[PDB]
Amino acid sequence: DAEIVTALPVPLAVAGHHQPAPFYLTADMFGGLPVQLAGGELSKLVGKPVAAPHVHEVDELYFLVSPEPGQARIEVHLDGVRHELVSPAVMRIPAGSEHCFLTLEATVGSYCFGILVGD
Amino acid sequence: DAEIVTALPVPLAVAGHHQPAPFYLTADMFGGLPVQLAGGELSKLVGKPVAAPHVHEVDELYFLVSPEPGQARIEVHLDGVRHELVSPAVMRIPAGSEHCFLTLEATVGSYCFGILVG
Ligand SMILES: C/C(=C(\O)C(=O)O)c1c[nH]c2ccccc12
Numbered sequence A: 001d002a003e004i005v006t007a008l009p010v011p012l013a014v015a016g017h018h019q020p021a022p023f024y025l026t027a028d029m030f031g032g033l034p035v036q037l038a039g040g041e042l043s044k045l046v047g048k049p050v051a052a053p054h055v056h057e058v059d060e061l062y063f064l065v066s067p068e069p070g071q072a073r074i075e076v077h078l079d080g081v082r083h084e085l086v087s088p089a090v091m092r093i094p095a096g097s098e099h100c101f102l103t104l105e106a107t108v109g110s111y112c113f114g115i116l117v118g119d
Numbered sequence B: 001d002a003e004i005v006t007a008l009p010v011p012l013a014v015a016g017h018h019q020p021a022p023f024y025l026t027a028d029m030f031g032g033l034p035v036q037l038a039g040g041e042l043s044k045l046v047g048k049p050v051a052a053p054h055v056h057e058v059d060e061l062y063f064l065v066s067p068e069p070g071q072a073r074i075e076v077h078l079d080g081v082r083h084e085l086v087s088p089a090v091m092r093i094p095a096g097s098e099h100c101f102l103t104l105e106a107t108v109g110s111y112c113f114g115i116l117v118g
């Protein structure tokens, strides 16, 4: 009687996002989780932002990863300051901070996940 | 003065794992996190279990993903029951349950992450 979720991703609306974002962990899964996790593979998102600047009332971690280090690069706008992240990298976005990211470079298998931390 | 971690992954020992697992989120990051997240790319893990059956004191979620759906396939052993999962998939391993996974097939850029839930 294992607990398996394969109806994935779960599209959920997120502030400023053009489309609902694809979630793989949501707060209600498995009786409740302290995180939510959304994101996807970046290879076709180069130069195409998924959202306008937005703010959350919870902390958000960007997790950027690729099979080989350096194969993925995103630009994070944080309250009007630009930060370039190179895979692998984890960046904390404090709750209340205005932000978004733009994909600069991505191979097949590059991902950016946003991890919302429940407080 | 942004908070960016680039010294990654962090190899940490886990009971029953042949190697230290590669962690990308650890409990002490950023003043404390309610999860830890480890894992890695699966194309070089086909047929090579990362661990004997093992147990954690916390829940662990397997998160299986591949660039295109269906491109990665793992076998999850949970308390003597075999489960074959196809990406994308998330499976909860209750704390104390003996478990491990084996990669059957994976394209480059497929991942399995183990998420330890505080
Ligand atoms: C942390 C962890 C476990 O505890 C497990 O294998 O159950 C991993 C999940 N995916 C992995 C991929 C490579 C190395 C380790 C893991």
Ligand SMILES: CC(=O)c1c[nH]c2ccccc12
Pocket (backbone or CB within 6 Å): A017, A021, A022, A038, A039, A040, A041, A050, A112, A113, A114, A115
């Ligand atoms: C937080 C984050 O990275 C994302 C939020 N929405 C997305 C859609 C495609 C890929 C990544 C994302």
Ligand SMILES: [Fe+3]
Pocket (backbone or CB within 6 Å): A054, A056, A060, A099, A100, A114
């Ligand atoms: Fe965000």
Ligand SMILES: [Fe+3]
Pocket (backbone or CB within 6 Å): B054, B056, B060, B099, B100, B114
């Ligand atoms: Fe485990």
